[PDB]
Scaffold this active site. Sequence first.
Site, short mmCIF file in Angstrom:
data_model
loop_
_atom_site.label_atom_id
_atom_site.label_comp_id
_atom_site.label_asym_id
_atom_site.label_seq_id
_atom_site.Cartn_x
_atom_site.Cartn_y
_atom_site.Cartn_z
N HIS A 88 -26.01 44.14 -9.48
CA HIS A 88 -25.20 43.18 -8.75
C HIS A 88 -23.96 43.87 -8.18
CE1 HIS A 88 -27.51 39.80 -10.47
NE2 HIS A 88 -27.47 40.49 -11.60
N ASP A 91 -19.01 40.90 -2.64
CA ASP A 91 -18.50 40.98 -1.28
C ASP A 91 -17.52 39.82 -1.14
OD1 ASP A 91 -18.07 40.50 1.49
OD2 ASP A 91 -20.17 40.77 2.03
N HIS A 93 -15.28 37.92 1.38
CA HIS A 93 -14.96 37.69 2.80
C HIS A 93 -13.45 37.72 3.08
CE1 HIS A 93 -18.95 35.53 4.11
NE2 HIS A 93 -19.16 36.70 3.53
N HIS A 128 -19.56 36.60 -2.49
CA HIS A 128 -20.94 36.54 -2.94
C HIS A 128 -21.48 37.92 -3.31
CE1 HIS A 128 -22.73 38.19 0.78
NE2 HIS A 128 -21.82 37.49 1.43
N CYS A 129 -22.55 37.92 -4.09
CA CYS A 129 -23.25 39.15 -4.43
C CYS A 129 -24.04 39.62 -3.21
CB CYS A 129 -24.19 38.92 -5.61
SG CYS A 129 -24.92 40.41 -6.32
N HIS A 138 -30.12 37.06 -3.96
CA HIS A 138 -29.02 36.90 -4.90
C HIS A 138 -28.10 35.76 -4.49
CE1 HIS A 138 -29.28 40.58 -7.60
NE2 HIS A 138 -30.35 40.64 -6.83
N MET A 143 -25.33 33.22 -6.46
CA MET A 143 -24.20 34.15 -6.60
C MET A 143 -23.20 34.05 -5.46
SD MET A 143 -25.78 37.45 -8.57
CE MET A 143 -24.14 37.79 -9.21
N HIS A 248 -18.83 14.86 4.46
CA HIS A 248 -18.36 13.54 4.83
C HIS A 248 -17.98 12.80 3.55
CE1 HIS A 248 -18.28 9.63 6.96
NE2 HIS A 248 -18.83 9.15 5.87
N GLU A 272 -14.27 12.30 10.60
CA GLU A 272 -15.27 11.54 9.87
C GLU A 272 -16.18 12.50 9.11
OE1 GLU A 272 -18.16 9.30 12.39
OE2 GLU A 272 -17.40 10.53 14.05
N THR A 273 -16.60 13.55 9.80
CA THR A 273 -17.52 14.55 9.25
C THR A 273 -17.07 15.89 9.81
OG1 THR A 273 -19.30 12.92 9.16
CG2 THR A 273 -19.96 15.24 9.15
N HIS A 299 -23.77 15.18 5.54
CA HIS A 299 -24.24 14.05 6.36
C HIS A 299 -25.47 14.34 7.24
CE1 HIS A 299 -24.10 10.09 8.16
NE2 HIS A 299 -23.01 9.78 7.47
CL LIG Z 1 -23.05 8.29 4.87
CL LIG Z 2 -22.81 38.99 4.39
CU LIG Z 3 -26.38 39.74 -7.65
CU LIG Z 4 -21.12 37.40 3.41
CU LIG Z 5 -22.28 7.87 7.23
#
Ligand SMILES: [Cl-]
Ligand SMILES: [Cl-]
Ligand SMILES: [Cu+2]
Ligand SMILES: [Cu+2]
Ligand SMILES: [Cu+2]
Lengths: 334, 334, 334
Positions: A88, A91, A93, A128-129, A138, A143, A248, A272-273, A299
């Site tokens: 493992h 990373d 971001h 993430h891994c 992974h 992960m 949402h 809303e969303t 949603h």
């Molecule tokens: Cl909904």
């Molecule tokens: Cl990536």
């Molecule tokens: Cu991993």
């Molecule tokens: Cu990434």
């Molecule tokens: Cu809705």
Amino acid sequence: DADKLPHTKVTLVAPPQVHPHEQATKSGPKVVEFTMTIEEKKMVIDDKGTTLQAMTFNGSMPGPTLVVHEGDYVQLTLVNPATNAMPHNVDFHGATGALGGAKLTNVNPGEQATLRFKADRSGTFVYHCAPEGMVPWHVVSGMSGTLMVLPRDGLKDPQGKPLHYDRAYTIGEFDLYIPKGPDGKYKDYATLAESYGDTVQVMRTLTPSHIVFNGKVGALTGANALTAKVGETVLLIHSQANRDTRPHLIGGHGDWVWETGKFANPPQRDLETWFIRGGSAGAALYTFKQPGVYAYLNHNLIEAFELGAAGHIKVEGKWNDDLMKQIKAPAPIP
Amino acid sequence: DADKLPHTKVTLVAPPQVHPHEQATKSGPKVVEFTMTIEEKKMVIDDKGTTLQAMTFNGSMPGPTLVVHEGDYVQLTLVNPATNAMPHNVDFHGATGALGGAKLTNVNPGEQATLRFKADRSGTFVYHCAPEGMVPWHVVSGMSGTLMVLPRDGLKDPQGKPLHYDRAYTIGEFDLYIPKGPDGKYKDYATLAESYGDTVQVMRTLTPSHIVFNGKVGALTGANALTAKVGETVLLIHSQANRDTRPHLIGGHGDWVWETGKFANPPQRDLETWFIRGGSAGAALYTFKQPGVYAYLNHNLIEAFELGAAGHIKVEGKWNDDLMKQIKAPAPIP
Amino acid sequence: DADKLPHTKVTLVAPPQVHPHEQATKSGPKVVEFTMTIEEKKMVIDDKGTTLQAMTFNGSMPGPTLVVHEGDYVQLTLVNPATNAMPHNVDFHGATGALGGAKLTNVNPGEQATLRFKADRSGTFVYHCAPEGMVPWHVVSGMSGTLMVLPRDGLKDPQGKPLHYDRAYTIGEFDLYIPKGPDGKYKDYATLAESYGDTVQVMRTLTPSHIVFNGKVGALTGANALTAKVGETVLLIHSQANRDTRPHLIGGHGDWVWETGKFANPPQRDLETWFIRGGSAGAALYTFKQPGVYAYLNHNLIEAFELGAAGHIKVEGKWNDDLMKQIKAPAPIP
Ligand SMILES: [Cl-]
Ligand SMILES: [Cl-]
Ligand SMILES: [Cu+2]
Ligand SMILES: [Cu+2]
Ligand SMILES: [Cu+2]
Ligand SMILES: [Cl-]
Ligand SMILES: [Cu+2]
Ligand SMILES: [Cu+2]
Ligand SMILES: [Cu+2]
């Protein structure tokens, strides 16, 4: 010089909680120390006994949320115990260089490593891994998690007014690709390695078998609901390391939302969303005005109700008839 | 009057390069002349011999990027040689009227046509073929690229500060729909026309068999990597004429990103992953701070690593331990 | 107090029209009364006789668009006639509390109910049916539409300049999941209830059989085209209650677009293609500069041309050679 700066050791907590932290702070840059331990384990992911040969940071999907402030340095010790089968890494971001740290954190079972990086950009960021040749497996096996880098002076609206939250919740949404046998039933694997080939074939269809918040169908529903009260402001952190989603709040809104998740940009209001791009974390603020049980969901309602991407928020307080009132209850048509 | 304005003849170059151009310019509006020649050809699109009966502008997927400034007029001569089998045309999303020019550029094999339009809106814009009744097939078979209309005074951040890039790269991402036979192997077609029926059936499943940058799995990986150095600012233009994508630079960021691709709007900063809507081109600026090999990919990691939507950027320069440092290398757990 | 405020009774009209309304208004808050009646019915959704066991507000997909101003109270009477088979309700994304009103509007066949809520947030908002345990089925079967809450002083650009439209059109886009039998033909169901099981199985594949504007393939094409003239400004309201879409006007642009659909946020300009998140409504302004037949479509071109998500706008007026001119018509290559 980072070597000279003072250090702190943060204790992580399990999702959906986020470890206690200051928003606006008077402290200057520190090296903030974290430790995470990888756990491969077989997890039940739905109410009908389906299992996932899962891979996790700290035993949870998502991994815990790490919180620092802009200008701090994150110093993570990543532990891969000998009880695990796979290599493992991690990373971030939020980090700059070496594939987010992945090239500097390759740990086989029985090994650990320590990575430092400057958290010089504010926002919620996926970590993430990403082991070479095994990256999507992974990630979709569990992960990932969120690093939140808060501005030193806290969150701000588009006009620079201070925004503040009373509690933060972290939701990781996981598109799962569980294989089926000739009988149409989900496969159950004795080991993690035995699940790989069949899972890759399902992955390539781009059709998840399940899409779950925090590791399981109903992980945040009924009794596991998030909680709040009328007048309380919550920050809802939403991560999706592999696939798009569209959060949402049923009966609510995103009062202020950073859907791309980066706090130096002005948020949008009254959503809303909103939209979390696969490979990112975003964040929404909401102040509750009404009591009751809310749903918080993806949603695409098929993805929510059929495949599992839905949770609840139970909110205490007094009902507001100005905001909403039942004028005439359900009754026979005259 | 456009008829009176001075003319220039631009020479296009193959992706991932973009033909040389000024950013900020002191010139006034000109009629900028381009020529593109359509080439239908059979192309190998993966490392296991799979072929696509492809259709291209200028022999490449994507077609070349055309660069003008806001207020210029684009004057394109589109050539469809007699060696081709199908009719073609061009729809410029940067243009106003006549279905983007498609209604005025219908060329059968053996024919050519010349279209002029005013580039009065700044941004990166998709152009693509759109023959009546054949639109999605021509687009997914390779017939798209980018028109970049730069502001006359160059790119600006949200506060109006000048932004400048040292080089521009253009990445076209292509969702491909290659049919399979009863044996589960990809079909190989003798002619373009023979591929149509089977391809439409795959298209209708909405599940690409491959998703590739610039015409092939690995088109921009290993030896074909994009290049830069520490301190250099690159503009990454990303087009997707048919389907959404979510670009991410592993170990980097989008310093300033116009994900909807229109330069009169303020960009967002510090993005981990951005979003290119199917039917659009967007652009991201990044200044490299660390050396090494970066990945640039669609952060649906299945789409990237399994289906082909990933490239590399090799960056020369000096490592910055402040930004990132390996504190303790992988070693046994005590 | 809302009980004291004056009342108005709005008469709704069928899509794609929107009932007449003021944009900027000098009136203060009112309680705006609406009535909608649910109709379950079997509808033909394509040109080859395929049927949907549909569910609608007011007999149309989408339901009609309701228009009020920020600060008004929406007072809806929802009627579920005895001729219907299923229970229904309504969730307004524009409302605060009780799952958008769904908990207060549960009506069995033969029942009606009246809900009031404060429209305190400006924007276009989805409303949809959401009966407990049946939510996605009712939504994908047709039970959604738009509530538009206009700012009291009308629409504004990012610098606060007034924006005004001459007409508003409402487009609801519906991802449909029609089952097939062993013979590969679409199933035809005698009753609504009989369609449920098979439809849920198709829904779970996340692959629509059809994606239609306003209830049918070609609902807004040829003779049913939207109309405008050169110099006219149109507002294009686009709702998608379940699934993402990416609207594009072929030969045009979004002059000003609120893709997340919330008018207190600054719009973006010059968009080629915008993005409506599943579970939301957005809006675009465009002033026509050229005559002719435009296409308005989802720019996943497979979704548009193969599956049905495309309409037309026929525009009268004088051609502008400055904006676009055919310099040389299609002719033999020299
Ligand atoms: Cl909904
Ligand atoms: Cl990536
Ligand atoms: Cu991993
Ligand atoms: Cu990434
Ligand atoms: Cu809705
Ligand atoms: Cl198009
Ligand atoms: Cu063509
Ligand atoms: Cu187009
Ligand atoms: Cu209903």
